Amino acid sequence: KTSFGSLKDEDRIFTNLYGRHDWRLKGALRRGDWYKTKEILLKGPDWILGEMKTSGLRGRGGAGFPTGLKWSFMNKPSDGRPKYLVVNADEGEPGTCKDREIMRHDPHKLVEGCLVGGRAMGARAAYIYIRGEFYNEASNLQVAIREAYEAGLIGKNACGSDYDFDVFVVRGAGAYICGEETALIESIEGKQGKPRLKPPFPADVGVFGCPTTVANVETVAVSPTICRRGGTWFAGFGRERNSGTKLFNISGHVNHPCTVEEEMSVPLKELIEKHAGGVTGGWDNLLAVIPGGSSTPLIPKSVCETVLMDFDALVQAQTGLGTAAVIVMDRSTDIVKAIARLIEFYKHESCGQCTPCREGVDWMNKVMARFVKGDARPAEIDSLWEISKQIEGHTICALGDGAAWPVQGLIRHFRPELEDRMQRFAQQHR
């Protein structure tokens, strides 16, 4: 199929996204969950990993790495140490709400995916590191986990199989950087949320020094339905190498900001006009869009006209598909102030380990504040571009890249706006 979108409700993988249909275990069994899971576990780890590889599911964390290959990193025999699955329920990126929605409205999908992924890797426990601000979501997840333990779906007989698994929930304490892979591992281990270098990879040294695999909530939540319904089906959705369904959050200046499940490779304009009710004032009033959450740069209306919603499509459009969090800005907004607020966010949420990210993102925050006021000079635009290029690729984790990229997008597209602000400031202060 050349065109994508208009996903069928019977093909929606995240039924009960809107809080109906009794999120507890009885409603999960009515909607279809924990079905043939014993058959899946007895079918075994190699079959599950081959199912993931044939489905072609990619990380849904924003990373974009092939889930099947990443999970098949740990198909080794035993070492002496246990193995762990870790789920990232931190969801700290601006624009992103999908993990919160699925944890509070269909948590048994997350629990079943923890069990299936833990069996696929070969493991004894899944630590769900949830965000600290999601107290009600964490309590609902604990209610679901207690119901699964009472039903015998976890612990000493995984759904009647001879596999032993445990599911723990550990809450954060308010750090966006703890959504990172190794920083989350450190936060579980009880230190500060500072990411560690790679190598060693988490598949060799993770939490407590054990082989671990860190996976997104949406990834593990679509995992057991991928195993159950094939994977050729999941690859049938979406384009080549960008396959399946995706939870798009749409926020900002849209008529109905909402979280909706939609097929991959759907047009941005089609997605907004079909699910968000359109831009406030119209598609002509649309100025810019951030398609990923906050780590991805801007795309203006001109390229937003025809862009698709793939990793490859946004890479071609000099952006990325991160958490699929379409932030929409119409013409009646301060785009420089929005980008400066994003740099404020990255300055406040930097963990402070690397000198590049630490000092450079503080520097970016000050330069962007002066850009918003107008008291800069047009040479400082290229100076800020070089500061961004110095930050990017020179840090331990990708928060430095995710702070450099919105600056690069703003400089790339809305440079006459910055120059206009500077000349207006200069002529009004002289």
Partner: protein, 87 residues
């Protein structure tokens, strides 16, 4: 942490008396061979130069640092004591 000031063999003399000037409090000296750092590319060259000029010498061997096993993954050990508590 720089090591460029090593790797050249220095010949120096024994330190003599540096007393205090009665007028100004400066450091007065009586021997001319006080600041006599001589640079040589090899220990045998320094030995030959000292023997040729007729000075008694004490030569001490080069103290290279020992090659050490370094692994970043030891900071997060599962059972060993090398696990750190702070990054």
């Amino acid at each position: 942490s720089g090591v460029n000031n090593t790797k050249k063999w220095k010949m120096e003399f024994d330190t003599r008396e540096r007393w205090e000037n009665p007028l100004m409090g400066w450091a007065s000296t009586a021997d001319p061979l006080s600041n006599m750092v001589l640079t040589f590319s090899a220990k045998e060259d320094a030995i030959a130069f000292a023997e040729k000029n007729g000075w008694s010498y004490d030569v001490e061997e080069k103290k290279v640092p020992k090659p050490k096993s370094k692994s970043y993954g030891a900071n997060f050990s599962w059972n060993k004591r090398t696990r750190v508590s702070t990054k």
